[PDB]
Design a protein around this ligand. Structure first.
Ligand SMILES: Nc1nc2c(ncn2[C@@H]2O[C@H](COP(=O)(O)OP(=O)(O)OP(=O)(O)O)[C@@H](O)[C@H]2O)c(=O)[nH]1
Ligand SMILES: Nc1nc2c(ncn2[C@@H]2O[C@H](COP(=O)(O)OP(=O)(O)OP(=O)(O)O)[C@@H](O)[C@H]2O)c(=O)[nH]1
Ligand SMILES: [Mn+2]
Ligand SMILES: [Mn+2]
Ligand SMILES: [Mn+2]
Ligand SMILES: [Mn+2]
Ligand SMILES: [Mn+2]
Ligand SMILES: [Mn+2]
Ligand SMILES: [Mn+2]
Ligand SMILES: [Mn+2]
Lengths: 192, 191
């Protein structure tokens, strides 16, 4: 897994392309009327027993990288998605690997309204891929509990696909949710 | 933790009790049209970032174990559980611990019709505890993919609460889903 630019990745010869998106919306809710949720971020349990972002292989010679993702998004999340924009302005980063397939993964971040995320969760059960590729949607706990492990650190101890965990960390710093030192603290507490 | 009978654990004083349940239904669906799903098993992502079964603490001095689970299941899974009765016949096993704290955990298993699991999934977003104490429902992949890892083996590499992983393995053997050899197989490919 190595960092590559969009402009360069698209001119690669033969390698397979993939697109995935973090969908998120602000929230005033408090766990135990005490711990702020801050933000709702969506991930999923996949058919393969691993956690990941919605999306997938972007049929490279079809339409745009955006159109490919949009399709996967509706395929995997459901009908509510047809009215989700997801432009080029929602592109974030790309990576190349030769690990298992020789592949390029493109990460996307889009902010929605909480109402929108709620409806997406609500209609997720109607996605072509519900119970198939998508075993259920989940929210990322952003907080850390009093035992300093429960919440996000404990969350990061689950099994992630490709480099979705890497991508998640990126988003967290990217959206100003946690500084680097906090990100390191939650990893160290998660390591042991 | 340690094995204890139901009747024996209910005679204990100064212990905490909790009940958790695996709701499941048969399915004819085939992943990629080739790989049988076989059965649908519900678990959840919890507030603490771990996988677990729905359920919770029950005060034995106020309500029975069944009433407690019943209320906790409505709270955690939502309104569709009003049509579902998990009774004494669904009770399976109990484990007891003293350290860290005096706690007894009861495990229930109940079969439903596929439309019931589907409706529970649909209405879980209305649960009192959704997006707070319950972060979302998930199905347990029962199959192993061609790489011999994807599916159940990889799922078992996730972060589970208390002995919830062990409750799941018990259910797999109990429901005649996997042989003792297959469970050991699935477990090896994990670690
Ligand atoms: N970096 C990163 N890679 C991922 C993520 N999810 C999947 N991958 C990798 O992307 C590739 C395929 O993506 P999938 O989502 O499994 O394929 P899919 O698009 O759902 O399947 P199709 O419906 O046929 O398009 C695999 O090699 C995974 O390793 C993710 O969230 N982040
Ligand atoms: N064996 C087992 N233990 C669990 C499971 N889930 C939680 N526990 C443990 O059982 C105890 C209570 O479980 P919780 O369900 O987290 O507590 P709760 O009563 O649901 O929380 P409230 O919604 O605030 O009432 C805690 O010690 C957990 O660590 C489970 O699925 N199986
Ligand atoms: Mn996908
Ligand atoms: Mn897909
Ligand atoms: Mn596809
Ligand atoms: Mn596919
Ligand atoms: Mn609970
Ligand atoms: Mn509860
Ligand atoms: Mn409770
Ligand atoms: Mn509650």
């Amino acid at each position: 897994p190595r960092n590559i630019s969009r402009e360069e990745s698209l001119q690669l010869e033969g390698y397979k392309h993939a697109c995935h998106a973090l969908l998120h919306a602000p929230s005033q809710a408090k766990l135990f009327d005490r711990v702020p949720i801050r933000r709702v971020l969506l991930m999923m349990m996949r058919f393969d027993g691993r956690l990941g972002f919605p999306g997938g292989f972007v049929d490279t010679r079809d339409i745009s990288l955006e159109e490919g993702l949009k399709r996967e998004l509706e395929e995997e999340l459901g009908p509510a998605l047809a009215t989700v924009e997801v432009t080029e302005d929602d592109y974030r980063s790309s990576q190349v690997r030769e690990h298992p397939q020789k592949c390029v993964t493109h990460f996307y971040i889009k902010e929605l309204k909480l109402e929108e995320i709620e409806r997406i969760e609500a209609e997720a059960v109607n996605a072509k891929d519900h119970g198939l590729e998508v075993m259920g949607l989940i929210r990322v706990p952003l907080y850390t509990l009093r035992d300093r492990v429960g919440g996000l650190p404990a969350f990061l101890c689950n099994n992630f696909i490709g480099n979705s965990k890497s991508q998640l960390l990126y988003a967290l710093r990217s959206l100003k949710l946690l500084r680097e030192d906090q990100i390191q603290e939650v990893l160290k507490a998660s390591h042991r």
